[PDB]
Symmetry: D2
Subunit: 258 residues, 4 copies
């Protein structure tokens, strides 16, 4: 089976990568980083996020596995000490999580896939956008910005913004406010909003049309924007699971105690 | 078709009820408040909640309609001025929202259905419970209490507790904290948690076993509790809709401006 | 010097109390629990709160010291192992913290002093009060209740309600909301409010006049209430300090890590 | 008496300015925008903030007045229709509000005065700083940034970040978090913190030393920062008041209803 390994690039992770490669060498396994069917990420969640984006064009052909040699490592299912057990075991059931499609339109159009979230802020200056849900104008948002999160993303930036944590079996996206202004004149919903598949949330500029748009902690300035459009993707990320590690246990281990 | 009308019981609502009855009298419609197939509620959300509980044993045989003569009236789809249009029109498509099943166990067992939410607080004294998700211990909660909300309930008590607003097509329940203690010694997740169908959240007492349990703003003291169990119900509430009034528009009208 | 010791009443605390008494026996110190000048509390913050209320009529004659044999123990300045050092040292500078005066009026009048906070909730049923600041109507509050905190109280219930932590050298009181309803019809400030000395906050009933009123975790049902009035007290609690233990370090130790 | 008028620069504000000048022409009043003793700002809060910074070197010689022709206008005490009454009346008691001193140090040093707040964010990349209160390390902050607010600033950016509203007679500054990360590994206080005069809060970089620093909505990139230091200023802003318009009424009018 074709596979590749990414590494955080520190000494621990590179050696672990070389060892697993040596170990895969004792089985019918081909190292191919062009068309892998298995992608192993060794490092933190940042490393895992990079792996996902490195291969976001072949998501339906790939199953991902994360090994943690980072700090928090929330998409990690394995400690390094378990690495040889993993090479053997891999020589399994697939689990799918929902993703977020962002469409950015100008005056052509670009689309992006997120595993955690997509956010919008201004290119400096006040941020003001009209929020339109399924063609119906919902609110005019004034403030720092907005965050649209996938279910697995809900434990990340979304969480820090007061969003709910959402089991990844729920096909949804969640919109949270960053520092909205609310007074006599200006009004937002305040609460996070959870949208199902097939709902489209569109942000439309009011004055300024330059925005800093992020997808999974890669941030780009987009100029001359006419619309930013959010929807649950039809595409999913697939994980190879070799044992039960339930989402809520993963949440417990990362936030309550481990 | 068999139908009945509940009323908030003020002058406006009683007269409106009598008028619709007179109007139904001109069609093939039988007033039956034992086995209605249509239940019309005239009043606020409190009136609607009472109607739902009056008939919670025949939910699959009934389609509800709310007319607002109350204050906020969030489950209302009609203004009173539109009442004659409604009797005629009713002489339609059905829409279903998810419900919450609460199981309370002692040392037998009682179950309750909620349209908005179920909450737990102590019978006076400190509230401390162990929160167990799918048999796995998740956290020990210290504080004022906990709230488990349906999707349509998310705009109610849940909202005031910092919960996310959740489109009612999502089959889920949402758990929010009321004033949790968080220090060096005590730790909760903080964030709201959204659970899918088939997940079971169980609250288990630590010391005290007396709790004040609410279902939709009816509150009862339960003694000698061993467990409180939450799960998305298999049962649904059915609304008769005669026109499009999308959930997010309903949210916009109630919170942003109407 | 006249002194007394209260104890949490577990074995650890009673023995520690007996030992300090024996130790004070070797100095010019008289045990007097009617007119102590020093009040030593051995236990948690609950024990300390009880000590304060036991002697709230002689606050200007007393200096308090807390020893922690409890759990969190936030008003504690000493670990038990340091107890003999304390008896000797005590054989010192005084530090004063602000207090909250609550006035409850009927149809006579009762006043209460709080070290942590005073809260108001309804006697069951919806809670609705008009909030009047310095005779000017500020808001109509709908929700679970309200909390008025002293500076030292800000790390307690206030904190769980989203209040700010306030250095106790600031002569102020802080009002926080418990689960306020906010929609098209109903509106509260949302934010905590910090009031200086000489500002009076008055809660006035709208319909129901029965309230559950708490002062430092002692809760009483008050009937036929016309007004609840809050103001920074002219009275202060005095601590004996034998070493520097700054408030922010105390906050750090209790919430960040110790 | 020497005076000057700033204007938002729209037609309404310029004409109003010219009219007041004409009106001052009928009294013993000299227009001097180098050494005014009275500074009238005609526009919104942005206009008022600019006026304050235009003259921040002569704050003890000046009394400010705001006229609102803007949108919200929170530092405004007058509607335009009242302008002639103001010129006459001005032909009064002074009110002082506290200010925030920010010190930025490199490897020399710059100081800034704020009327609303000072914030710190990173120059792109993760923001991580050590927060040191009075030389004692309090927390390591990971997240979007931090906001230090004056009392009058508490109704502004601070409010949107969950800060408490603070009566401006309280000599204090308030620190609020922007989107802090909190998990198994990383921990912040969460709550806003209110500091008295003479307390020093120092932010110290961990890795990156480039920060975007704002003072009252003027934002500058500072490079090679060793420390950012916050303290209640010894300087105050003075308002000329011609009538009672209490802070809490000002809050009520701006947030609850006017
Ligand atoms: C800014 C910054 C870095 O902080 C990001 C933190 O969130 C973590 N993280 C990334 N993705 C997720 C995620 N999906 N859930 C929870 N935590 C996450 C990441 O490991 C790191 O601890
Ligand atoms: C680095 C790293 C891990 O991935 C970056 C993740 O950091 C998360 N993040 C970024 N900024 C913040 C933030 N301020 N608080 C919490 N999480 C954050 C966000 O989810 C992003 O995908
Ligand atoms: C306590 C109390 C009364 O306040 C309840 C408020 O919430 C409203 N309410 C009830 N159910 C819902 C609901 N499901 N969504 C939004 N608002 C709701 C009710 O109409 C009233 O305005
Ligand atoms: C009366 C009425 C309408 O229904 C009562 C609803 O009030 C809501 N509720 C009760 N207490 C609060 C509260 N404190 N804040 C907001 N909503 C509340 C809750 O959802 C309950 O079902
Ligand atoms: C309900 C309940 C018991 O929880 C109260 C918690 O708050 C603690 N506590 C009491 N007073 C304060 C206080 N003033 N500051 C911080 N924590 C406090 C008390 O020790 C306990 O940990
Ligand atoms: C027991 C004990 C210590 O003192 C009780 C303190 O508990 C605090 N408290 C009560 N309920 C809560 C609560 N739900 N969350 C946090 N603190 C709370 C409150 O400050 C009260 O004075
Ligand atoms: C970003 C941006 C513009 O929004 C700033 C909003 O806050 C208002 N504002 C400025 N200063 C204050 C202030 N000190 N208090 C309340 N509101 C304020 C300003 O008028 C405007 O409505
Ligand atoms: C423009 C203008 C009025 O002054 C700018 C003020 O906007 C406030 N501000 C900036 N960003 C936000 C924001 N996101 N939310 C609320 N207030 C904000 C902040 O207090 C700043 O001083």
């Amino acid at each position: 089976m074709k596979y590749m390994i990414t590494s955080k690039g520190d000494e621990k992770s590179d050696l672990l990568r070389l060892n697993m490669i040596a170990g895969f060498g004792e089985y019918d396994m081909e190292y191919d980083d062009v068309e892998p069917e298995i992608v192993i990420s060794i490092g933190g969640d940042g490393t895992f996020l990079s792996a996902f984006h490195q291969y976001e064009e072949r998501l339906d052909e790939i199953a991902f596995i994360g090994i943690h040699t980072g700090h928090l490592g929330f998409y990690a299912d394995w400690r390094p000490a378990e690495a040889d057990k993993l090479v053997k075991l891999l020589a399994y059931q697939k689990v799918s999580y929902p993703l977020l499609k962002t469409t950015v339109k100008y005056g052509k159009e670009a689309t992006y896939l997120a595993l955690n979230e997509s956010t919008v802020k201004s290119s400096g200056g006040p941020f003001v956008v009209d929020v339109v849900i399924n063609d119906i104008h919902f609110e005019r948002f004034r403030g720092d910005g907005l965050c649209m999160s996938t279910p697995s993303g809900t434990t990340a930036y979304n969480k820090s913004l007061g969003g709910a944590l959402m089991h990844p079996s729920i096909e949804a996206m969640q919109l949270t406010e960053m520092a909205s202004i609310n007074n006599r004149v200006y009004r937002t919903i305040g609460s996070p909003l959870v949208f199902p598949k097939h709902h489209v949330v569109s942000l439309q500029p009011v004055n300024d049309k330059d925005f800093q748009i992020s997808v999974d902690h890669l941030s780009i300035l987009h100029r001359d924007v006419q619309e930013i459009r959010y929807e649950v993707s039809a595409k999913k990320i697939h994980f190879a699971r070799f044992r039960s590690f339930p989402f809520w246990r993963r949440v417990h281990d990362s936030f309550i105690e481990d």
